[PDB]
Design a protein. Structure first.
Lengths: 181, 278, 43, 420, 420
């Protein structure tokens, strides 16, 4: 155990396996999804990995994720799944931590598949949440100009209510994903 | 000792005030999360939190009352006990049988606590007029406090003091089982939990006290916002309470110095062989 | 209006299923998600 | 539950300061508010739990024309309490009228403290009957408190002014105050000035500095009365459960107190029970008979001995009371406090309802009637004049206290089915 | 993203200096600008990353007729910031007119700083309502900022002038400023002068030097409000994601704040949640009910206890708010900062929308209307005169604040489908 955790640094792998792959850090992730907004909203049939890697480099150098070791940072890279003619970037996307050490015996491929599934689940919900935050910002910005249009005040108020129903549900679920999970 | 012999009361008077709206509901209408949370509320609000073992204190219902020992439609109010789980090397002494004995004690003591706190609540409604029901209230409350005091300072405290000496002089684990079973046998035996009839007179006494509290509080709340609405029912309850009192003393004098139980319980000599028999 | 009705209809059905699915873990979601008891006061 | 204390009158503020100082010494509290280094026990009734665990006393000091409050101000114990609860003639009607015009802001302070408290049980009153400024204003506040809060308890600690004369108008003031105490209070703890003065001259050899000692006496009594709440047992850890046994009827709510050591700075419980039933250990002065007796013990007690003691004292019949009904003695137990050196650690208290205080009241009823009959002792005070130009409120209180004495003497009879 | 701070008004520049000093002490920064020797954490929002890693504060100080700026000048912390962002009557209209003529160069400074920043998120405002020179010019700058940047956020920290009186024209000025704050600001953090003054007189024994302490209080509050951004977690590490939950509707954007230790120089989270729901820990003053409550915790927390605490406090119903809909409490967690000695390391903050501040606004609405009705308190100021010869802008603001109070009271009702 001594030689495994010093010569190959087995524990650093776990620490970077939560922070990044399991989306455990999120300074990195919000800027990452911000830079990946216009690219992934565009349909992913014309998406190739070389456009992902270069913007990924800017995102990792800019954020807090930069401060850890370049080895585990190097072992982080994107990957994609197979394409469809109905494909869009938020549907098909992955982070893939590739193993170059003998640590595969403790990080077997079945649990890597588990990592993949939990990541996809936590990717979709973080996309839709930012859509909701966009809706709230649009509410907070547009409505101070629609004070001179009196007749919309009914429907515009009513939208305000429904947002609050979603904002609740999307802020409690995302706290259950924070704690105990 | 801290919870079953009820050594903290702050625990209970914190609890029962803040559990009552769930306790008053019928059986199968109660639900575990509220009682579990409010038990933790009563614990941490109470001062005794420094004890190591408070996390085996659970709550369970036994709606099949002292009949099982050789209510039925309400729970939380009555049919109440604690589930207590034990660790594996501690299971060698304290186990299922001890746990059942603890619940059979604590339920009976819980009844005596509850009727007292009912009478305190009917007192505050009025802190010329009719005052005999006031005397009935005072007599009932003083009697139930005397019952509780008698059990606390005859059974629980002195035999606990004995038990704390028995394991000090212990020599093997076949002696500590003997001390535990003899202690438990004495605690059942001296109390009203061992009798061939289990003293049904006591339950009837407590029953007519509950009826008294119910009808009196309903009358007072109707009054704040006639002679049948007050006086007739009060005389019925008074007659039944007196009858049960003399019945208890008569049925207790024949059993088994140790006649001193009657000497403390009626200390003025009221209602004491006022009714000759045969 | 009809969108609001539709959404509020389905989310209540989610919660009432959520109450008895798993004993402890999934049950904890219901307390956080039904704080105000505004649900079951709609049905 | 949670009890707020109110203190008014010069002697009342004296004993409030002494009481809070005694509890700060008794519990693990520094005189800055900080918890002591060596601090299990409950401080969640009279002490707010503040930010640095600062057990800030739940007290409201009421005063007008302050003199002794300045002496409270320059003290190391002026940092234990006063989170600004201090708010700045010797006639009853004067203090009544002055409390009338400033009823609103002091009631606002009371509501502020009620909002500050999570729960509420009672307002305990530090009072001095016919203390001049305390008289009248205290009755006014008692009436206001009974009006605004019909769901809470009112306890009154007060001394009864008798020093064998002085003031020719004080029986009038104390009579009006007693009328208010009978109607607007739930339970009254009565104290006598001459009795405590006589005990102070007895066990010690003082004649003047009686105040400084009597503060200690009342503080010890009041803390003893609250010890089972402050030090949690499980018998009557609520005020209301304790008070329910002590009051046999809403007309008799005056409580006689004792203290088993006249000085405590290894006898058994049997001895001190016999001592407590001797009236020299009783600190408040046909046959006069108790209605109901309670006692509270705190010390090194063996649990079998209390039973056999109750047997033997019952058989000896040292309880010289004849009731009209079934009421008897009640026993209670409390914990001896730590951090306080006590030789002869057994210490007890008694709470009993005794008719003898009627005679004391009768003494005042005689005196006031005498000064009413000669009519040279009302002195024509102006506050008394515009408050009541005909002075029929004194007649009203005379009516009430006459009814009270008759209720007393009907309770003396072996039937209370007849009234008085 | 990247947030620029603007500071104006004497108290605003005081708390800005204290805030920057507090963050320089909090992070690994020397007062020269140099990174400390022992410096993981983000300083990439309010601190420009300069040539020697000099975390130069992204701040613009706006002033006219400087007095306290000279005291800023002679300081060791005058080398942390000021890369020349400092630019040199007590009427609203006076400051409005003076800001009108020099709008261009200060807007040029703002555009310069916007060009200097790579990204942008918001302009946070240090403001003093009716601070004299700060009033009017602050409203003018707020209107300009909303005009020029329709894509950015505006946060306002300000105190509300109440000292129980002083200035007869300040309710007019604060009313115009409130009209501007309602329309030209995105989210407002409200503070009360008398409330913070009362807390300062409470926990300490000061009466005059309240400024020096209140600077600390607001600095601690503001830094606590930004800690999860400054110390990166992953819940709401953007301003906009945090603000989205706090604002339930664009008409109610005023936020009530607390602070769990009144003094912090080992209780659990359950206790301090109960403390925070007590209003003595709340620092901003029918039933008044919260719409939405959030809390942020930083300390030594066990992650299971927060769940069970939420269970128990939910069941205890210490949340005395009745909403009109589904809105509930929200929990958040932050990191305890290093290099700062903290006893009782658990520290929390609350952000809640509460209707009670309407009453405070109503107090001013009463006062201004009173001084409008007697009409001896406008005093005929000339800046007010040529700015508005008919003074109908005051009527316009009165209209808006009336609509605001009606919106408040419609939100108090259990339906907001009806408006007010």
């Amino acid at each position: 155990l001594d030689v495994l955790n010093k010569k190959y640094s087995l524990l650093d792998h776990m620490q970077a396996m939560r922070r990044y792959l399991l989306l455990g850090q999120g300074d990195f992730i919000r800027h990452l999804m911000d830079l990946l907004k216009p690219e992934l909203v565009r349909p992913a049939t014309t998406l190739y990995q070389h456009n992902l890697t270069g913007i990924l480099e800017t995102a990792v150098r800019a954020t807090n994720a930069q401060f850890d070791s370049p080895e585990i940072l190097r072992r982080l890279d994107v990957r994609l799944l197979e394409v469809s003619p109905g494909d869009t970037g938020w549907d098909v996307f992955s982070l893939d931590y590739h193993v170059d050490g003998p640590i595969a015996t403790v990080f077997t491929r079945e649990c890597m598949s588990h990592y993949l599934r939990v990541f996809n689940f936590l990717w979709r919900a973080k996309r839709m949440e930012y859509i909701l935050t966009d809706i709230r910002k649009g509410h907070m910005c547009n409505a101070k100009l629609l004070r001179n249009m009196p007749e919309f005040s009914g429907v515009l108020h009513q939208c305000h209510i429904l947002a609050s129903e979603m904002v609740h549900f999307i802020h409690q679920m995302q706290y259950y994903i924070t704690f105990e999970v | 000792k801290r919870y079953f012999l009820m050594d903290q009361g702050d625990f209970f008077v914190h609890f029962m005030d803040l559990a009552e709206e769930e306790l008053r509901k019928p059986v199968e209408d109660i639900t575990p999360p509220r009682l579990e949370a409010l038990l933790e509320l009563a614990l941490r609000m109470s001062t005794a939190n420094t004890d190591p073992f408070k996390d085996d204190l659970k709550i369970d219902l036994m709606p099949h009352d002292l009949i099982t020992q050789l209510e039925l439609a309400l729970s939380g109010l009555e049919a109440f006990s604690f589930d207590y789980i034990v660790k594996w090397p501690l299971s060698l002494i304290i186990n299922r049988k001890a746990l059942t004995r603890y619940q059979m004690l604590f339920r009976h003591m819980f009844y005596c606590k509850h009727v007292e706190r009912q009478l305190c609540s009917v007192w505050i409604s009025n802190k010329q007029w009719f005052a005999g029901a006031f005397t009935l209230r005072q007599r009932m409350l003083n009697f139930v406090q005397n019952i509780q005091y008698y059990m606390m300072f005859e059974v629980m405290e002195p035999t606990w003091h004995i038990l704390e000496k028995n394991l000090k002089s212990a020599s093997n684990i076949d002696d500590v089982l003997g001390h535990h079973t003899g202690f438990l046998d004495t605690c059942l035996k001296d109390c009203m939990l061992t009798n061939p009839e289990l003293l049904k007179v006591f339950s009837k006494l407590m029953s007519v006290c509950v009826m008294f509290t119910n009808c009196m509080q309903k009358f007072t709340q109707s009054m704040k916002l006639l002679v049948s609405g007050f006086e007739a029912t009060i005389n019925k309850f008074d007659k039944n309470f007196s009858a049960h009192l003399l019945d208890l003393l008569a049925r207790l004098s024949i059993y088994s110095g140790m006649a001193s139980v009657i000497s403390r319980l009626d200390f003025n000599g009221f209602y004491t062989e006022r009714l000759e028999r045969l | 209006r009809i969108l609001t009705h539709f959404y509020q209809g389905i989310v209540q059905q989610f919660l009432v299923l959520l109450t008895t699915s798993s004993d402890e873990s999934l049950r904890f979601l219901s307390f956080r998600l039904d704080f105000n008891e505004h649900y079951k006061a709609r049905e | 539950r949670e009890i707020i204390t109110l203190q008014l009158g010069q002697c009342g503020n004296q004993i409030g300061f002494e009481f809070w100082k005694q509890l700060c010494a008794e519990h693990g509290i520094s005189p800055e508010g900080i918890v002591e280094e060596f601090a299990t026990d409950r401080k969640d009734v009279f002490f707010y739990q503040a930010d640095d665990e600062h057990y800030i006393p739940r007290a409201v000091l009421l005063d007008l024309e302050p003199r002794v409050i300045h002496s409270i101000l320059n003290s190391p114990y002026a940092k234990l309490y006063n989170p600004e609860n201090i708010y700045l003639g010797n006639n009853w009607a004067s203090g009544f009228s002055q409390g009338e015009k400033i009823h609103e802001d002091i009631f606002d302070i009371i509501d502020r403290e009620a909002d500050g408290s999570d729960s509420l049980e009672g307002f305990v009153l530090c009072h001095s009957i016919a203390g001049g400024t305390g008289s009248g204003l205290g009755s006014y506040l008692l009436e206001r408190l009974n009006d605004r809060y019909p769901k809470k308890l009112v306890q009154t600690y007060s001394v009864f002014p008798n020093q064998d004369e002085d003031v020719v108008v004080q029986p009038y003031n104390s009579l009006l105050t007693l009328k208010r105490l009978t109607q607007n209070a739930d339970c009254v703890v009565v104290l006598d000035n001459t009795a405590l003065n006589r005990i102070a001259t007895d066990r010690l050899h003082i004649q003047n500095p009686s105040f400084s000692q009597i503060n200690q006496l009342v503080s010890t009594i009041m803390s003893a009365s609250t010890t089972t709440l402050r030090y949690p047992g499980y018998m009557n850890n609520d005020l209301i459960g304790l008070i329910a046994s002590l009051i046999p009827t809403p007309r008799l709510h005056f409580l006689m107190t004792g203290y088993t050591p006249l000085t405590t700075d290894k006898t058994t419980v049997l001895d001190v029970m016999r001592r407590l039933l001797q009236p020299k250990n009783v600190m408040v002065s046909t046959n006069h008979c108790y209605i109901a007796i309670l006692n509270i013990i705190q010390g090194e007690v063996d649990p079998t001995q209390v039973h056999k003691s109750l047997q033997r004292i019952r058989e000896r019949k040292l309880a010289n009371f004849i009731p009209w009904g079934p009421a008897s003695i009640q026993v209670a137990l409390s914990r001896k406090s730590p951090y306080l050196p006590s030789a002869h650690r057994v210490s007890g208290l008694m709470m009993a309802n005794h008719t003898s205080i009627s005679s004391l009241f009768e003494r005042t009823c005689r005196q006031y009637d005498k000064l009413r009959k000669r009519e040279a002792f009302l002195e024509q005070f102006r506050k008394e004049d515009m408050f009541k130009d005909n002075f029929d409120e004194m007649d009203t209180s005379r009516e009430i206290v006459q009814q009270l004495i008759d209720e007393y003497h009907a309770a003396t009879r072996p039937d209370y089915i007849s009234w008085g």
